[PDB]
Amino acid sequence: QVQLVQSGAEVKKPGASVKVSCKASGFTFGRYSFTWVRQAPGQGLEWVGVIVPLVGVTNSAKKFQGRVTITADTSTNTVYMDLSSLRSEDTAVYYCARVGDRFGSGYAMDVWGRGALVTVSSASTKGPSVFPLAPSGGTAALGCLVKDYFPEPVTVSWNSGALTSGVHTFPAVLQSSGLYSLSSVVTVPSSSLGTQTYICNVNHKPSNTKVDKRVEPK
Amino acid sequence: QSALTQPPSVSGAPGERVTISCSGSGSNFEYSFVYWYQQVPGMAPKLLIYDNYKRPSGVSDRFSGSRSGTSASLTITGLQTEDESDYYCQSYDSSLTYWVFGGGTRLTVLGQPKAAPSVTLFPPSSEELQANKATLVCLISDFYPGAVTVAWKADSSPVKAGVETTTPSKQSNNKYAASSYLSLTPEQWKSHRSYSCQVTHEGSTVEKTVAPT
């Protein structure tokens, strides 16, 4: 049940720097090695770098020359990767992986951290504008449009959790302006349209924006 | 560093046997060790095979590795639906201290029946039009396999300008969903007599239409 506990998600502007940590759980550095593997969205795994804390050696892929510094702290068993002058290509999930058996032999990455998403974008934090999508033995569809926010994620509830059936929140779209938009729709018996109210509760935690929008028939 | 070539993907039916190849261009690739990783989408990679053929604890014995000439192969016996994942081979260059990954192989487990997409189309709300904005919302859901194409029409003519469409995403019922948005101006929306989101999936096109009310 050994683990590699990583730091969380970070949103960065291009040209900035990011530092991701990776702390050993249930073991110490010993003779193990620690690598950094990243995955850009919709692409394959890419090896970034490595550190052998016992001997202090560090290396990293050629395309990261001068941009990555891998360090370690043996007293807290934590590994650090620092990636500077960020660009859009660096948007990725950064994993740390332990390498080698308990004698420092072997090169397979056998223990993996859960990963840390790094987003590189020139867009600034913005809360969403919420608009109702009015409905017009049949079912009815009504929804909420959560438009022009950054960054991810947003949560959408219906009637403060009380309505959970027929709810479909679709993955968001990334506009050319760098802001996101998504929609949440609920399918209800059309006869229920005149029985009760429908409120979608939008929460955008990166901007502490909370919006309740009533959705009414046209 | 040298490069490891993997198959673009692999497909099989439940209970069938599938093999994934891996080719290295380096001169020493035949004798160097090869490792195999499985990444379920949404999760971190996990080691399946190390040192050509050895299998860690807790990895099913229907995964096996082998070497043939200057190549490596992963063999998945008795296919199951969870075996859908990306599979990466990897090699380690000792003279560079480099790890080199393969391009990855997407394994699709055949069997799930073809499902047509349900389309829901929303016009711009009156509140959005009062904010001098306008967005048409095409919500697509319940389709399998996980691929659609979306076209928009202003009256009876294509648009392309302002179309933002997401990638397919896997729903909780193992079918797929997608969204397509058309940004417009309040005057463009009231300029045309209607718009039509046309979703194409397996040679069949599903259409919905909305008009200013």
> In order of start, what are the domains of chain A with their CATH numbers?
3-120 (2.60.40.10), 129-215 (2.60.40.10)
Q: What is the largest CA-CA distance in chain A?
A: 72
Tell me if B125 and A37 make a contact (CB, 8 A cut-off): no
> Please, are residues B88 and B101 in contact by the beta-carbon 8 Å criterion?
yes
Q: How many residues does chain B have?
A: 213
Nearest-by-CA chain A residue for B180: A173
Which candidate from B135, B179, B181 shows the least CB-CB separation from A171? B179
Is the CATH code 2.60.40.10 the one for domain B118-210? yes
Quickly count: other Cβ atoms within 10 Å of residue A189's Cβ.
12
DSSP B6-41: --SEEEE-TT--EEEEEEE-STTTTTS-EEEEEE-T
Side by side, the strands of the sheet bearing A199-204 are A155-158, A199-204, A209-214
Does A177 touch chain B if contact means CB atoms closer than 8 Å?
Answer: no
Q: Are strands B176-184 and B169-170 parallel, antiparallel or unpaired?
A: antiparallel
Q: Note the Cα A67 to chain centre separation in Å.
A: 22
Evaluate the CA torsion angle A61, A66, A67, A70 in order and state its sign.
Answer: positive
For residue B126, the surrounding DSSP H or E stretch is helix B126-130
Q: Please tell me the distance in Å from A191's CA to the nearest CA on chain B.
A: 19
> Please, are residues A179 and A150 in contact by the beta-carbon 8 Å criterion?
yes
For residue B187, the surrounding DSSP H or E stretch is helix B186-189
* Domain range annotation of chain B: 4-109, 118-210
Quickly count: other Cβ atoms within 10 Å of residue A28's Cβ.
9
Q: CATH fold of B4-109, please?
A: Immunoglobulin-like (2.60.40)
Phi-psi region of B129 (alpha: psi -120 to 50; beta: other; left: phi over 0): alpha
Evaluate the CA torsion angle A62, A64, A67, A69 in order and state its sign.
Answer: negative
CA distances from B1 to A47, A166, B98, B102, B170 (A): 11, 52, 7, 12, 36
Experimental method: X-ray
Q: What is the largest CA-CA distance in chain B?
A: 71
Beta strand residue intervals within chain B, DSSP E: 4-5, 9-12, 18-24, 34-39, 46-49, 63-67, 71-76, 85-93, 98-101, 105-109, 118-122, 134-143, 149-154, 157-158, 163-165, 169-170, 176-184, 195-201, 204-210
Q: How many CA atoms lie within 13 A of B91 on its CB side?
A: 29
Give the resolution value in Å: 2.5
In whole angstroms, give the CA distance from residue A38 to residue B39: 13
Mutation choice for B interface testing from A39, A45, A57 by most B CBs within 10 A:
A45
Nearest-by-CA chain A residue for B54: A108
> Please, are residues A7 and A21 in contact by the beta-carbon 8 Å criterion?
yes
Q: Compute the CA torsion angle A88, A91, A96, A100 (nearest 10 deg).
A: -60
Q: Give A-chain residues touching B104 at CB under 8 angstroms.
A: 44-45
CA distances from B18 to A165, B80, B109 (A): 39, 11, 10
Is B74 exposed, middle or buried, given 0-12, 13-18 or 19+ CB atoms closer than 10 A? buried
Residue B144 carries which DSSP code?
Answer: B
In whole angstroms, give the CA distance from residue A79 to residue B46: 20
